[PDB]
Design a protein around this nucleic acid. Structure first.
Ligand SMILES: [K+]
Ligand SMILES: [K+]
Ligand SMILES: [K+]
Ligand SMILES: [K+]
Ligand SMILES: [K+]
Ligand SMILES: [K+]
Ligand SMILES: [K+]
Ligand SMILES: [K+]
Ligand SMILES: [K+]
Ligand SMILES: [K+]
Ligand SMILES: [K+]
Ligand SMILES: [K+]
Ligand SMILES: [K+]
Ligand SMILES: [K+]
Ligand SMILES: [K+]
Ligand SMILES: [K+]
Ligand SMILES: [K+]
Ligand SMILES: [K+]
Ligand SMILES: [K+]
Ligand SMILES: [K+]
Ligand SMILES: [K+]
Ligand SMILES: [K+]
Ligand SMILES: [K+]
Ligand SMILES: [K+]
Ligand SMILES: [K+]
Ligand SMILES: [K+]
Ligand SMILES: [K+]
Ligand SMILES: [K+]
Ligand SMILES: [K+]
Ligand SMILES: [K+]
Ligand SMILES: [K+]
Ligand SMILES: [K+]
Ligand SMILES: [K+]
Ligand SMILES: [K+]
Ligand SMILES: [K+]
Ligand SMILES: [K+]
Ligand SMILES: [K+]
Ligand SMILES: [K+]
Ligand SMILES: [K+]
Ligand SMILES: [K+]
Ligand SMILES: [K+]
Ligand SMILES: [K+]
Ligand SMILES: [K+]
Ligand SMILES: [K+]
Ligand SMILES: [K+]
Ligand SMILES: [K+]
Ligand SMILES: [K+]
Ligand SMILES: [K+]
Ligand SMILES: [K+]
Ligand SMILES: [K+]
Ligand SMILES: [Mg+2]
Ligand SMILES: [Mg+2]
Ligand SMILES: [Mg+2]
Ligand SMILES: [Mg+2]
Ligand SMILES: [Mg+2]
Ligand SMILES: [Mg+2]
Ligand SMILES: [Mg+2]
Ligand SMILES: [Mg+2]
Ligand SMILES: [Mg+2]
Ligand SMILES: [Mg+2]
Ligand SMILES: [Mg+2]
Ligand SMILES: [Mg+2]
Ligand SMILES: [Mg+2]
Ligand SMILES: [Mg+2]
Ligand SMILES: [Mg+2]
Ligand SMILES: [Mg+2]
Ligand SMILES: [Mg+2]
Ligand SMILES: [Mg+2]
Lengths: 49, 250, 99, 70, 50, 91
RNA sequence: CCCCGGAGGACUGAGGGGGAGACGGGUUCCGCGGCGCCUGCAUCUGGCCGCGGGUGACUCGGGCCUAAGCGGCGGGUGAAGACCGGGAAGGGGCGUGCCCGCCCGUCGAACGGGGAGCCGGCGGAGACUCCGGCAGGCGCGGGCGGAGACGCGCCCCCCGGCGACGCGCACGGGGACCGCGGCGGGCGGCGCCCCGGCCCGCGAACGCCCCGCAGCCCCCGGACGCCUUGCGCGGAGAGGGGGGCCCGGGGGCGGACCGCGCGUCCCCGGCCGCCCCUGAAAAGCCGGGGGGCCCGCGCGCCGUACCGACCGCACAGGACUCCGGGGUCAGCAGCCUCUAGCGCGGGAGCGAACGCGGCUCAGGGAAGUCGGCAAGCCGGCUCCGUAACCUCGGGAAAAGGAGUGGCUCUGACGGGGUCAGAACUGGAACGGACGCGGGGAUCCCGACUGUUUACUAGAAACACAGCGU
RNA sequence: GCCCGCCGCGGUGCUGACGCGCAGAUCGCUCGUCGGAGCCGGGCAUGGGGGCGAAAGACUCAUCGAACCGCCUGGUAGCUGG
């Protein structure tokens, strides 16, 4: 959870993602949607596309 | 022919005295004086606090010094709905609001009151336990007496200059939760008195109690004892009008 | 090696004022050093929060300047409380005189 | 003797009811000298012992020699 | 104990001070045959209650 | 996924003390753990601190109330009746 | 010589046969000498005997404060001894003469509260006490800045503060400890290997500057966000931008070798949970409102040695608390160990019965016995698979099965171990010692956790929540 | 006031050892409990026909169906010994 929160926080600050996508993914992380960091980065590409 | 029984040993005190350490003090109404006797005086609720051994909470309330400079601190049994920073009033001209102190003569019939004096100025002794109240029943002006209902349901005449507090005592419902364990009873009575646990008379030897002895546990005679029995004899059911569990009372 | 030490106080009963820490000395030795309890700082008379500006040191060891704040009711009220008192006084004057 | 030769200190027995100020005054007035500091104890037999350090500009060798202590 | 009052210290000190034998010149002077002081005591088998 | 079927918060008691007592405590303990609405704060932040003592965690008022709920039915009725009796004393 | 020395072989095994305190003991402490008594054997040993010695404080404790208590109080009562007690014209400032005032104890804690100490050294026996160095405490003498949050002499009456406080699974930070490498210095062994084994590489109180997460506050402005492992927070003003205060801590300069890690213990922080339980007091010190007005000198009294050398007639009993390394491991378990320490009414020979503590036994398997008493079987970890009944929480580790070593590899998680998989190999072995449930079908009693006949009875007896009078 | 289990606190069975004891109640193995009606230390309170007792007539300094110490007291004995 600390690894996932650190990565999502960095992107929102850099404005790579917006604040609403940030909140949807923050919730999905606390719900055990992602098993590691790589799976999370792929889900970001898909949402962004 | 025996030893002294448990109820005979409690009167001396020793290990049977009340556990009063870390208690906040005695709870009382404000003392009646010139200013309240002629008008009204103002106080502010400073805190609502838990008192050791007591079910209902207490309120620390501050008034001004009426014979000097500074302030004066009082402890009140708290009516339900009282809150920190509230303004309370005490006198012959105080208004009808929860938390105010008024003579029972000036209080309308139908009203809930608490901490009622049975004689004027004694500072309050009736309906003090959590969830209790007294009703004001009627006023008789010529004799200058008021009729009240006590929490047992008995009726009583008191003076009309006896004071009371508007409302009912907070903490109500407390006895509706079962104690689940011996431990909860242990904590509850550790806050009060050395009165627990309880050993039955029939479980003792005849030297310790008049219910003791025998090859089966059993009392042996009737357990209704008369009103004029002496100390050491007055165990069981004292001067009972009737016994047994039957319905249909009122 | 062996770094075990013996008690420094008169008795060994370890109450809350008999706590030590450990430190290495210039002579290559493990020494015990007492850890004082830290007193609280003064709190607001109206709301019970720490007064800003005063260090957590008993006032006997502080100079006079350090023990105070520069405002009416400097060390007694937090400032929100002072504002509330000023407003109460003025507005109640206004509503007691001239209706 | 080590105590007198270095540390410039002399050791006496004194009356148990005597305090450090009384001891300092008495030594000053009797031996015509200057005391610097006084330690004391009561022995396991009940006597009082005084450790008397003289001033940094006085010789305990010399005062103890005039006494006879050497 | 290491933390003792001066009164108990002094009474203990007197017991220690007087726990002694008869001098030999005293034996010669007073013409004694009994030479043991039977008011002596030893810490292992004593019960000084002072 | 739901973890018990019926016992709810009384699952802490295991198999002890019987059915009627556990049934009473489910109700009592739910009531005394609940959050209540602060009659001043405007917000639902009031929690119990002792038997009859309730504090709003936002605006920090303290209030005197029931043993296991903030209001009681006798107090609701009494307050209504006392208010009416006052109003009748205003001519 | 059971004493001392050297060499070897072992043990206690950090909850110590170690290092130190409280209580109790009272000189048992140290040096020199000795063997009459004691040291259930001996002794050249010694807590035994003789002779000399020995415990140093402004900063440690006691003295002070108050806890639960105890005493005292014009008086009250009783044949007294004595016991019981607020209703009493109850004392202070000064400076004449004014002014303020309702009425106790310099009894009760060598663990609670309580101004202030660190390092190095020296002795046969003392040290936070001596000596040297460096500090700290309490005393006595020769009206301004800021926008703001905030920053930079007393005395009386009243309002306040500090002192000053419960428990808990987690999570986070510091300190000490512990490890792995580098580099410097020194050892040991060495039949073969060995840059692979071992030891040493140290920095206090205190003063000045900076730096400090959480948390609380200020300014702008006015909102579908911020954020924790968990939560939590916001028009009663979030986020963003800039600031203030606290923080038992860290760094630099003083005082005066270099990196990188998992974990343990201690203290601290912010939260969250719990209670028919809500978790001392006072001396002392300080703030607010109103009103009136640098250099010198000193710090008195008492304890301080040693000991499980204490109580049990002297003794496998009883006897409170500190500090707590390594390996295996879930581990303060068991087993082995570094540092430190090393008694335990004495030895030799033989290898009968019998006993006491242990071990193994063909074939059968409770036939023994009042009775499976005693003993044995089972046991770690992972996966599979689990019935009747039930107050729906349980029963449950139900019952029953299978795997587990060494070596060579591979994958997953952001330097660190864990988890998963494969090939090879060994008497057909692997929780290889150690540690560590036998299971099931029923009947009677008591609902349950708890309590008891100290020294022949632990239960079906007592208690209990609930119920009733 | 949950379960396995260490120190601690207790004391089930062997009807084991011992029983001229290590000991006027101990030792070995096994066993109950181990976050709570839990365990431990100091100070304080309750005094004998009284106290204290989750109750066994238990405990009250090796003494308890009425402690211990001195006196009344060389108490009386139709009973045993000389
Ligand atoms: K009788
Ligand atoms: K009786
Ligand atoms: K009696
Ligand atoms: K009686
Ligand atoms: K009795
Ligand atoms: K009781
Ligand atoms: K009962
Ligand atoms: K009976
Ligand atoms: K001593
Ligand atoms: K002795
Ligand atoms: K000798
Ligand atoms: K009389
Ligand atoms: K009397
Ligand atoms: K005193
Ligand atoms: K005291
Ligand atoms: K104490
Ligand atoms: K003390
Ligand atoms: K305190
Ligand atoms: K003020
Ligand atoms: K000493
Ligand atoms: K033989
Ligand atoms: K034989
Ligand atoms: K059989
Ligand atoms: K047979
Ligand atoms: K068996
Ligand atoms: K099995
Ligand atoms: K393997
Ligand atoms: K039973
Ligand atoms: K249990
Ligand atoms: K039982
Ligand atoms: K028995
Ligand atoms: K028993
Ligand atoms: K049992
Ligand atoms: K039974
Ligand atoms: K019983
Ligand atoms: K155990
Ligand atoms: K038994
Ligand atoms: K046997
Ligand atoms: K035993
Ligand atoms: K357990
Ligand atoms: K009594
Ligand atoms: K007593
Ligand atoms: K008696
Ligand atoms: K008697
Ligand atoms: K006698
Ligand atoms: K007599
Ligand atoms: K007699
Ligand atoms: K007779
Ligand atoms: K007779
Ligand atoms: K005879
Ligand atoms: Mg019985
Ligand atoms: Mg009777
Ligand atoms: Mg001294
Ligand atoms: Mg060993
Ligand atoms: Mg010696
Ligand atoms: Mg001998
Ligand atoms: Mg001090
Ligand atoms: Mg102290
Ligand atoms: Mg020493
Ligand atoms: Mg305290
Ligand atoms: Mg010492
Ligand atoms: Mg048979
Ligand atoms: Mg039972
Ligand atoms: Mg028994
Ligand atoms: Mg349990
Ligand atoms: Mg258990
Ligand atoms: Mg005769
Ligand atoms: Mg006789």
């Amino acid at each position: 959870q600390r690894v996932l929160r650190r990565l999502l926080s960095r992107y929102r600050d850099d404005e790579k993602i917006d604040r609403h996508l940030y909140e949807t993914l923050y919730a999905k992380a606390k719900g055990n949607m992602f098993k590691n960091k790589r799976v999370l980065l792929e889900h970001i590409v898909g949402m962004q596309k | 022919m025996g030893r002294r029984i448990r109820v005979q040993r409690k009167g001396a005190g020793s290990v049977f005295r009340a556990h009063v350490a870390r208690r906040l003090g005695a709870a009382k109404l404000r003392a009646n004086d010139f200013a309240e006797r002629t008008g009204s005086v103002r106080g502010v609720v400073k805190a609502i606090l838990h008192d050791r051994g007591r079910g209902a909470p207490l309120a620390r309330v501050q008034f001004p010094n009426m014979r000097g400079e500074g302030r004066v601190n009082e402890l009140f049994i708290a009516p339900e709905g009282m809150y920190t920073g509230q303004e309370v009033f005490s006198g012959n001209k105080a208004t009808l609001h929860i938390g105010n102190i008024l003579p029972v003569g000036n209080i309308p019939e139908g009203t809930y009151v608490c901490n009622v004096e049975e004689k004027p100025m004694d500072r309050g002794c009736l309906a003090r336990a959590s969830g209790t109240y007294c009703l004001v029943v009627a006023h008789n002006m010529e004799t200058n007496k008021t009729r009240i209902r006590l929490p047992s349901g008995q009726k009583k005449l008191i003076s009309s200059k006896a004071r009371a507090m508007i409302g009912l005592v907070a903490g109500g419902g407390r006895t509706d939760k079962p104690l689940l364990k011996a431990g909860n009873a242990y904590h509850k009575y550790k806050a009060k008195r050395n009165c627990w646990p309880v050993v039955r008379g029939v479980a003792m030897n005849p030297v310790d109690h008049p219910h003791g002895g025998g090859n089966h546990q059993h009392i042996g005679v009737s357990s209704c004892v008369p009103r004029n029995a002496v100390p050491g004899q007055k165990v069981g059911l004292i001067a009972a009008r009737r016994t047994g569990c039957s319905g249909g009372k009122r | 090696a062996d770094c075990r030490v013996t008690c420094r106080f008169h008795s060994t009963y370890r109450t809350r004022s008999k706590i030590v820490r450990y430190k290495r000395t210039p002579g290559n030795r493990l020494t015990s050093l007492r850890v004082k309890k830290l007193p609280n700082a003064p709190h607001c008379a109206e709301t019970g929060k720490q007064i800003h500006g005063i260090p957590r040191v008993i006032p006997q060891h502080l100079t006079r300047q350090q023990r105070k704040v520069s405002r009416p009711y400097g060390g007694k009220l937090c400032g929100s409380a002072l504002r509330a008192h000023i407003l109460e006084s003025f507005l109640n004057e206004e509503n007691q005189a001239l209706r | 003797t080590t105590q007198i030769e270095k540390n410039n200190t002399i050791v006496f027995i004194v009356d148990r009811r005597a305090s450090k100020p009384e001891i300092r005054k008495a030594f000053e007035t009797v031996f015509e000298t200057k005391v610097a500091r006084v330690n004391t104890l009561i022995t396991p037999l009940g006597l009082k012992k005084a450790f008397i350090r003289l001033a940094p500009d006085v010789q305990a060798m010399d005062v103890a020699s005039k006494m006879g202590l050497a | 104990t290491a933390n003792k009052t001066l009164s108990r210290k002094l009474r203990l000190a007197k017991k220690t001070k007087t726990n002694k034998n008869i001098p030999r010149w005293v034996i010669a002077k007073d013409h004694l045959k009994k030479t043991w002081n039977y008011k002596r005591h030893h810490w292992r088998r004593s019960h000084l209650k002072l | 996924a739901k973890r018990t079927k019926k016992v709810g918060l009384t699952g802490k008691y295991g198999t002890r003390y019987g059915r009627a007592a556990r049934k009473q405590l489910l109700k009592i303990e739910t009531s005394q753990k609940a959050k209540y609405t602060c009659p001043f704060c405007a917000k639902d932040k009031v929690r119990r601190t002792a038997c009859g003592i309730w504090t709003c965690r936002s605006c920090s008022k303290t209030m005197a109330g029931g043993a296991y709920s903030l209001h009681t039915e006798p107090a609701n009725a009494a307050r209504a009746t006392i208010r009416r009796l006052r109003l009748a004393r205003e001519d």
